Write a protein that binds this ligand. Sequence first.
Ligand SMILES: [Zn+2]
Lengths: 195, 596
Amino acid sequence: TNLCPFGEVFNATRFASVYAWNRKRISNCVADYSVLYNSASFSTFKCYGVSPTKLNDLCFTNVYADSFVIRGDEVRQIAPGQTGKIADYNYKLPDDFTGCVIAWNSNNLDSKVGGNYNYLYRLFRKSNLKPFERDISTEIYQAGSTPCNGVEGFNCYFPLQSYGFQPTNGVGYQPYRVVVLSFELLHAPATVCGP
Amino acid sequence: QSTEDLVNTFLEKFNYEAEELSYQSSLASWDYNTNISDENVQKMNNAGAKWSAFYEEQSKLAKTYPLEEIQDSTVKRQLRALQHSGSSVLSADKNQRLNTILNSMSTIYSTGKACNPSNPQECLLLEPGLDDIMENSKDYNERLWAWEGWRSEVGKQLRPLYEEYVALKNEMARANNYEDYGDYWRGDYEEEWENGYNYSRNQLIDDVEHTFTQIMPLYQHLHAYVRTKLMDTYPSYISPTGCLPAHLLGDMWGRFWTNLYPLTVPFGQKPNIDVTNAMVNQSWDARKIFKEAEKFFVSVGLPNMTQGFWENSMLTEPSDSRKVVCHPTAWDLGKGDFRIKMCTKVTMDDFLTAHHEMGHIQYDMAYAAQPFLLRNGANEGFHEAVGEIMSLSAATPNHLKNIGLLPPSFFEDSETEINFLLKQALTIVGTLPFTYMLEKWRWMVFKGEIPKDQWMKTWWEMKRNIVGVVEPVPHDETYCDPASLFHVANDYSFIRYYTRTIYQFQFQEALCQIAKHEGPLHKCDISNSSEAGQKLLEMLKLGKSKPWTYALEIVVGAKNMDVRPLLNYFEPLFTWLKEQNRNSFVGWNTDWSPYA
Ligand SMILES: [Zn+2]
């Protein structure tokens, strides 16, 4: 009798930051992806790899969903084999990823008069992340050779920074909500195909 | 751990903080200007103080990084921009002293008073009425008393302050490795590059001199024509050979000659082109005005304008209790927001002003992509020149016929073109000698070539030799005439106008060449030509990243300012004035004076 919590995520008053992205696993329920697909309310749905036509019966082992929010200009940065701050240090996709990514504008809920400073993302890091890795660490970033000794100062920078969304901003700086559906490709029986 | 990595990281932090600070400050200033109250000005002050403190702290922090080892052009450009450190070098007490000089000068200029000699009770301030008297009146004594009283009431108070002002400014200039304050101002056009694009601070003087020498003859002939025409209205005072007296030039300081049109029309019978009545006939509104301007800009090739512009900008003077300043302006708040504020009425002037403002907005939209510290024009003059091109192109009769304001059967007559050329000339050509002379005087005063005792002697000698204007009443060393101008009291440079007026016609000539126009230049129209739009966009996108010499090279094909297009623009006027001045004298002699 359990149903997929599709509506529960959508009506959330708050979404987590990109660095601390939330993973929700889809199990023991069937969701109709066609109605979402046919609506086309979203401007940006461009995904490749899997053909929408007559590929629906090939079964998948399990379905995973990840949710995070970013700026509009960075919505293209969520794509395989691409480089930039969000992709390299916050969320990375494998080259051979199979699936699709969904994004829609969220100006009205997120924006507030005077600014919304709760939302966070990471600027600097020592090395690029490898696919599907999350870091929560808030250790101070050291650029110079001198030891930082745990206090901010010269050549010492805090890792995280805030987004600052306001209603009057332009299209590029408006908040967009991105939810990805990842289908695992393995030779496995794949019992719940979920057409 | 090379210094490049170190500088790059610092720069990234700065860029992401300064964006958020600047947006807050600009938003506060906008709501002040739209909505006036005490809370609004208090909020402006708080936001501005916060922004200034952050900028000062960051600049002091980054004076530390050695600059020579940087081997990338853009990063070097950004670091040089952040490391200006202008006035912090001076000590605290002297900084306070200079600040109180500037405040006192501005206050004295703002609240000046002048009173009639016949009627002591009547006393007027400059902005409400002295300007009205000077622009409208046609009486010798009425103009003379205003001209004398303004100087006698303002300059005597201003001069001792200006003395300490020049002394202290020279000290601060010397403290930061400059020979004089004039060098500091001239360093704006100074730029260092690699292959044939460098520019030296001293070359500006030579370039200005060379341009003036070529522009002189047209000014001579226009001066002769104006003298002959003004001989009729004032029979006794004006002499056939002498220079024109100062107080009859149409404004307080003689900067512009636009108000002398009624006295100097060549053909009074035929009227100038005005399409206000046609606008009222078709029931147009302000949004109609802006939509037509946007249509022109998309016709040339530039993008449409954002939805936030239509949603948030004020396009009409609002009713209610709300009070709004009426000066037109264009705003680029930051972070993708662009708004235009102006009270639009149904007139041709509003049409042209709307074109000018949207032009600025197009420039701002174009170079938005570049990093924060480089979001500005190539130099001062480019921003105004780009706007001027669009207005000049919009004013043509052909465009007005195309849009639908003028009847198709209307055709142009040579008298109307001559009148239009003279009206444009009185504004554009006349202003160049004034700006040139004022800049030269200021530069000489700063360097120390002109001793303190002979300031006014040199000022009026320069006026007589260069501009052709003679003082009505002899002036002693107590007066300070140059301080009467708004710009001198408020510490702004003035060469930007000369530079802009030079570059505007070069840009127009190049674009018209690309667009395949045949005939006189003054009939050019750039509508329905995508090539010109793309060529302009290529220069606009660059911003401040690359030398301005490179920017000019991209569009026009030359590395330095050239004055030939300006002469080409006014060739028919040159021939007509040559024909008309057959019997009159050309030139002026310095001996004659009104006081004799
Ligand atoms: Zn302007």
